[PDB]
């Protein structure tokens, strides 16, 4: 009937409404560069924080009337919240006894038991319990994963498609057999043939790549300048070169210079060939002209978009163009 939005994967983060007050409370009062004494962690309900043994005790071990914090907690957690949402509080006590606490979304194990409607004790790993518990489908984990962000300052990264494999694994480790995997057949649809279902995935599953890469590359271009530096791959080196290349570092130097994507500073024939004359005495790579090295001695962690942008000779023409200006 009504599909809310037809786009190849634009439902990545929450609604800007709920994502507005998502980080209003899930924020990190910045580390004062003090020396932490205790990093406590609690489960606390929406606003039902008491001065009892769960909270008030560990303060009272240190003489802090935690009758105050609970209020300062409820100064931030009593509204905004569906009833009975057990949050995690990361209380952090410094050597001046001044605490600083981040409220955090409920543990994903709490999410998982909700989204499947199972109580404590009903769920279990099959090797302890013998049965897959409540089903799920990947379509659901993608929304448990949207309220679970590592950096609640940067809700974007790590990406969603990369932190759903996290919540999926935590699920399987609890017995939550999701349907898209773990089973012979995916979720059956009244729409079309399995082929007319698989032929509509082979396009979607790859359209996501140019979506996922670009988001993996756009994040790369913002990464620290050292993260874009060159780190040659070590899959080619065989484990006797890989060991004879650890006793004398000279080989792991001449290698780096030998297989280094072309830049304005590495277009020195003698420099790049000085290495190439060191390896041959060591009987290392000898039948691989510079090109087929760069395509194998590249930082594999590069997104495929930029995996090419540095690839000789794509970076040979404009190579001598880009320089330290002045």
């Amino acid at each position: 009937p009504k599909t809310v939005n037809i786009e190849p994967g634009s439902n990545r983060f929450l609604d800007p409404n709920v994502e507005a007050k998502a980080k209003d409370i899930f924020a990190v009062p910045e580390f004062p560069n003090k020396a932490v004494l205790h990093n406590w962690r609690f489960f606390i309900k929406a606003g039902k924080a008491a001065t009892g043994p769960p909270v008030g005790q560990e303060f009272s071990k240190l003489g802090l009337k935690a009758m105050d914090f609970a209020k300062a907690f409820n100064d931030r957690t009593k509204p905004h919240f569906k009833d009975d949402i057990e949050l995690i509080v990361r209380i952090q006590v410094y050597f001046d006894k001044s605490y600083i606490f981040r409220i955090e979304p409920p543990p994903t194990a709490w999410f998982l038991l909700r989204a499947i409607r199972k109580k404590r004790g009903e769920t279990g790993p099959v090797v302890l319990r013998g049965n897959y518990c409540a089903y799920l489908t990947l379509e659901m984990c993608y929304e448990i994963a949207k309220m679970k962000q590592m950096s609640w300052g940067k809700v974007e990264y790590p990406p969603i498609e990369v932190r759903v494999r996290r919540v999926v694994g935590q699920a399987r480790r609890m017995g939550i057999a999701i349907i898209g995997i773990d089973t012979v057949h995916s979720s059956p649809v009244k729409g079309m043939t399995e082929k007319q279902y698989l032929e509509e995935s082979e396009k979607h599953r790859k359209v996501h790549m140019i979506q996922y890469e670009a988001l993996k590359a756009k994040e790369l271009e913002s990464a620290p300048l050292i993260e874009r530096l060159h780190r040659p791959n070590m899959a080619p080196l065989t484990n006797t070169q890989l060991e004879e290349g650890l006793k004398d570092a000279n080989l792991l130097n001449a290698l780096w210079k030998s297989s280094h994507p072309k830049s304005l500073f590495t277009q020195d024939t003698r420099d790049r060939e000085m290495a190439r004359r060191y390896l041959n005495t060591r009987g290392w790579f000898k039948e691989m002209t510079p090109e087929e090295m760069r395509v194998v001695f590249l930082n594999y962690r590069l997104p495929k978009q930029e995996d090419h942008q540095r690839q000789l000779n794509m970076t040979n023409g404009q190579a001598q163009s880009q320089a330290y200006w002045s």
Partner: protein
């Protein structure tokens, strides 16, 4: 543990259907009949096992337009589920996310035949763990002598 568990378990409130053609009763228990089993363990040690608490209709179960009760905020109801290709990497995760025995992964690398371009990433994150289970295995032995299986086991 008792704490950190949900007490109130809201129920699946189907928002809008994902189809115009009703899935007639006859075929419902004809496809659900296939789901009451789900594999487990991924090697020669493949174990087709049973799944308890099977939902009844999976044309409607999660493929679109149902709600999930992870209701958290005040103004955010049980969020609706957009269609499949509206979530990123889902039919790509279907290739990646699963129990991977390294026995089954290293024959894929030494033959460079990955079904997915991320199984090279689920491999490292899997070996980078097992090395950690050692660099912690040993940064403990620099304290004392910890000997495996040397204390009683069982009852």
């Amino acid at each position: 543990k008792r704490s950190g568990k949900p007490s109130d378990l809201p129920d699946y409130k189907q928002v809008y259907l994902p189809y115009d053609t009703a899935p007639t009763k006859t075929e419902l228990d004809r496809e659900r009949r296939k789901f009451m089993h789900a594999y487990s363990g991924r090697m020669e040690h493949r174990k087709m096992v049973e799944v308890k608490d099977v939902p009844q209709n999976m044309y409607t179960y999660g493929k679109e337009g149902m709600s999930i009760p992870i209701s958290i905020f005040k103004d955010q109801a049980d969020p609706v589920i957009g269609p499949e290709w509206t979530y990123p990497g889902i039919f790509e995760n279907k290739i990646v996310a699963q129990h991977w025995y390294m026995e089954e992964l290293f024959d894929r690398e030494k033959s460079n035949t990955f079904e997915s371009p991320w199984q090279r990433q689920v491999l490292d994150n899997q070996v980078k763990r097992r090395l950690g289970k050692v660099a912690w295995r040993m940064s403990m032995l620099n304290i004392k002598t910890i000997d495996i299986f040397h204390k009683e086991r069982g009852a």
